[PDB]
Every structure is written in structure tokens, then in C-alpha cells.
Amino acid sequence: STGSATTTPIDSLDDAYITPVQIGTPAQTLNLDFDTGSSDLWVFSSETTASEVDGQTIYTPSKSTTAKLLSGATWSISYGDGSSSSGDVYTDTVSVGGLTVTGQAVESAKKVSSSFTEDSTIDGLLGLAFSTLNTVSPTQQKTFFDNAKASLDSPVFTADLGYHAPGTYNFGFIDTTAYTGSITYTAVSTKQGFWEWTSTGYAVGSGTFKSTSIDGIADTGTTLLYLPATVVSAYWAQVSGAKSSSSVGGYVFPCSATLPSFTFGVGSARIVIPGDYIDFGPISTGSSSCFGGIQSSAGIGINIFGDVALKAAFVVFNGATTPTLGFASK
Numbered sequence: 001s002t003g004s005a006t007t008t009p010i011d012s013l014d015d016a017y018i019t020p021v022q023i024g025t026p027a028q029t030l031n032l033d034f035d036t037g038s039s040d041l042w043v044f045s046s047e048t049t050a051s052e053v054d055g056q057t058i059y060t061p062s063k064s065t066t067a068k069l070l071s072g073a074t075w076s077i078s079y080g081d082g083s084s085s086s087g088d089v090y091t092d093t094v095s096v097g098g099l100t101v102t103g104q105a106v107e108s109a110k111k112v113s114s115s116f117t118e119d120s121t122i123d124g125l126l127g128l129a130f131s132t133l134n135t136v137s138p139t140q141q142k143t144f145f146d147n148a149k150a151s152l153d154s155p156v157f158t159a160d161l162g163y164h165a166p167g168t169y170n171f172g173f174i175d176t177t178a179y180t181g182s183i184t185y186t187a188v189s190t191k192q193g194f195w196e197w198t199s200t201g202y203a204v205g206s207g208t209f210k211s212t213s214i215d216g217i218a219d220t221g222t223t224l225l226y227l228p229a230t231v232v233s234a235y236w237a238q239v240s241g242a243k244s245s246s247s248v249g250g251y252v253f254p255c256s257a258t259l260p261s262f263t264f265g266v267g268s269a270r271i272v273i274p275g276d277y278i279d280f281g282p283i284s285t286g287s288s289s290c291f292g293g294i295q296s297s298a299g300i301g302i303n304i305f306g307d308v309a310l311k312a313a314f315v316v317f318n319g320a321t322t323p324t325l326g327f328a329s330k
Contacts, residue, residue, distance in 0.1 A: 001151045002172035003099025007034065007161065010121040013280055014307060015223055017161060018121060019169055022095040023106055024064030030057050030123035034169055035221030036159070036195055036317065037304070039133035039143050040077050041094070042085055042107035043124035044116075052112050055120030061108065067092045075107045075135045080222065080300065085112040089136055094144060096126075099171050101148050105134075105141035125221070128157065128317065133193035145171070145319060155319045159220050160330070161311035163277055179314035179328035184269035188323045192302075194219070195317060197325050199305075200267060202227075204235050205260030209270070214303055218315060218325055222306030224280070225262075225273070226297035235262055235294050242292070248283050251292040255282060262294060264309060266327040273312040 007017040018031040023043070030043055044053060046060040061067035067090045076086035087110035094104040109124070116122070127134070131142045149155045152172030160178050161167040168178070189196045194217040201211040214227065232251065236242040238260050242253035253259070259275030278293035293308040316326030 001099055001148070002153055002170070003095075003097035003148075004168060004170045005097030006166050007169055008166045009162070009164065010119070012164065014161075014164060014311065016122060017167070017220070017307070018123075019096070019126070021126060023059050024061070024092045025066040026064075027095070028057075028059055028064065030059060031121065032124045032126040033122050033221060034126050034128055034159075035219070036128040037217060037219035037221045038077065038079065038125060039127040039129045039131055039193065040075060040107050040135055041105065041124070041126045041144055042075065042077070042087070042109055044112070045087070045108040047087060048109045049111055052117045054117050057123045059106065059108065059124075061090045061092065061106075064092055066102075067106075070105065070136075070139075073105075073136050073139060073141075075137070077135045080304075081115065083113045083115040085109045085116060087111065089141070096144065096171065097169070099148055099152075101144055104144055104147055105136060107136065128220070129195065130190050130193045132190070145317075148172075149319055157317050157319070159310060159315045159317065161220070161307055163274075163311050167311070174316060179330040181329055182269075183314070183316055183326040183328040184266045185316070185318070185324045185326045186266050188325055190323060194302075195323070195325055200265030202231055202265065203263040203270075204238050207238075209263065209265070211265070214264075216297075216303030216305050218305050218310060218317070220307065220310060222304045223308070224304075224306050225278075225294045225308040226300055226304040226306065227294065228303065229296045229298045232294055232296045235260070236292065244296075248289070248291070250295040252283060252289045253292055255288045255290040257290075264305075269327065271309070271313045271327055271329060273309060277308055277312060
């Protein structure tokens with residue numbers, strides 16, 4: 001089997017991407033944030049505290065003839081931005097882009113933190129990291145990909161995120177028309193439950209490539225690119241007037257700037273992030289200070305190749321017995 005679904009930016013800045021997902025019978029379509037940095041599929045639901053729901057589409061398990069309470073199971077998760085959610089669990093039929101999993105754990109939120117409530121466009125998350133990170137207790141549950149894997153034509157999914165445009169998540173096949181040149185594959189460590197890999201270095205603009213190992217995670221759920229402070233300083237030093245602002249919470253730059261590209265290494269290959277991808281617009285409406293798309297990972301504890309990086313590439317998440325990651329230009 002295979003599946004193919006379009007993913008769409010939630011706003012003009014590509015702050016996140018939503019992908020329609022069918023849950024239950026008859027189908028209830030919710031728009032979920034596909035997140036390769038977590039492993040829970042959770043949704044706003046009929047059980048979510050009323051004051052914490054504001055415009056989201058909800059899953060109502062009582063209206064699904066295939067929903068079954070997973071008795072005794074609870075979940076609770078916190079994300080890298082400090083947001084959180086928790087609740088109980090159903091199993092139900094879940095389809096993505098024509099690919100169907102029966103008995104998928106669908107984690108129903110009873111509580112969500114304010115950032116979720118305040119974002120009307122995201123109805124939940126669909127985790128695509130390794131199932132070892134799944135938070136369901138007392139019986140850990142498998143991700144949608146893990147459940148689908150054996151049925152797929154090939155045990156892979158791909159992320160093809162657009163810059164200020166829709167893109168695609170495919171399951172079970174590699175669309176050879178979706179990228180240019182060849183795909184370069186690189187080793188993955190699953191020890192922390194992430195798609196963790198080691199970039200071979202970077203360049204700023206037309207500058208020389210610096211060969212240096214940068215361990216990090218491929219994380220579709222993260223908006224920005226978080227790298228070591230040394231690397232990030234070298235990038236922003238090439239932008240007149242750019243500075244790290246403690247008050248704003250990272251590097252900002254004059255909105256009048258033209259940003260340089262940023263290149264990262266994948267083995268001997270190179271992925272170029274155009275400068276425009278690194279512009280996240282005014283820090284507040286009408287400001288001439290703009291927020292940067294490359295930020296320091298210092299104090300996160302891990303480097304994160306988020307959407308800023310991934311949307312410059314066609315990315316293969318290879319879930320074979322020994323997982324790997326592939327990157328191609330596009």
C-alpha cells in the first residue's frame with residue numbers, strides 16, 4: 001500500500017503545516033501537524049475542556065462506529081516550546097492520503113495548553129518519530145507509520161515541504177519526479193527516539209564550506225533551524241545590523257536586509273537554504289525588526305533541522321530495519 005497527502009502552511013510565514021487526516025467511521029477529517037520529532041497522535045476532541053477549544057475541529061469518538069476506548073490508558077506530553085496536552089485514548093481507523101491503519105491509537109485531549117487553544121488551525125498532532133517516545137501509559141502505543149509499515153510497498157515516508165506553498169507527505173514510495181539529482185542517504189541514531197543524524201558542515205552565502213560534524217534531528221514539527229551558537233553567529237555576522245535580542249528571544253535583523261543563503265552538508269552533498277527561507281517577518285505588526293529563521297540551539301540540548309532546513313530538500317525517512325535519512329535538492 002501507499003498514501004499521499006498534501007500538507008499546507010497554516011499562515012504566510014510557514015509557522016507550521018497541516019495535513020488532513022481521516023479518523024473514524026464515518027470519517028471525521030481533522031487537520032493535523034505531522035511531527036517527526038514526537039510519537040503521539042493526539043486530537044482535540046469532544047472530551048477537551050470547553051474553555052480550551054477555540055475554533056478547532058474536534059474528534060467525537062461516540063459518533064464513530066469503529067472507536068473503542070483503550071481502557072485505562074492515559075497520555076501526557078510536553079513539547080520543546082513548553083506547550084503541552086494530555087488525555088485518554090481510543091483506538092480507531094485512521095487514514096492519511098488513502099493509506100488506512102485500523103486499530104490506531106488516537107489520543108483524545110482532555111487538556112491542552114494555551115498555545116494550542118490560541119491556534120485555531122491545528123486540530124492535533126500526528127507523531128512520526130520512533131514509537132519508543134510515545135507517552136501512552138501503561139501500554140505504550142505505536143505511531144501511524146509504525147503501524148502501517150509492514151503493509152507499505154517500501155518502509156519509508158517522505159517529507160516535501162513547500163516554501164510559502166503546499167507540499168506533500170508520501171507513505172510507502174519515493175516519488176522520483178519530486179526532486180532533482182540524487183538522494184544522499186546518511187546514518188540515523190534512534191537512541192533518543194528521534195531521526196538523529198550528523199551533518200557534515202555548513203557554508204554561509206557564497207562562503208567556503210566548513211567541514212564539521214553537527215549532530216541534530218530532522219524535525220518537521222519545529223518551525224526553525226536550531227544550530228550551535230558558533231554556526232549561528234557566523235551566519236548573522238553576514239547581515240548588517242543583525243543582533244541577538246534577549247528581549248525578543250533570539251536573532252533579529254533589519255527588515256530592509258537581503259539575507260544570505262545557508263548551506264548544510266549531507267555526506268558529500270549540499271542542501272542550500274535560500275536567504276528568503278530564513279525571514280520570519282516583523283517581530284510585531286509594523287516593526288522594522290524581523291525574526292531570524294536560524295537560531296541558537298544552546299540551552300535546547302540538541303540541534304534541530306526544522307522546517308527552515310527541511311523545506312529546502314526532499315527528505316526520505318527510511319524506516320527499514322536499520323533506519324536512515326535521505327536528502328535531495330528539489
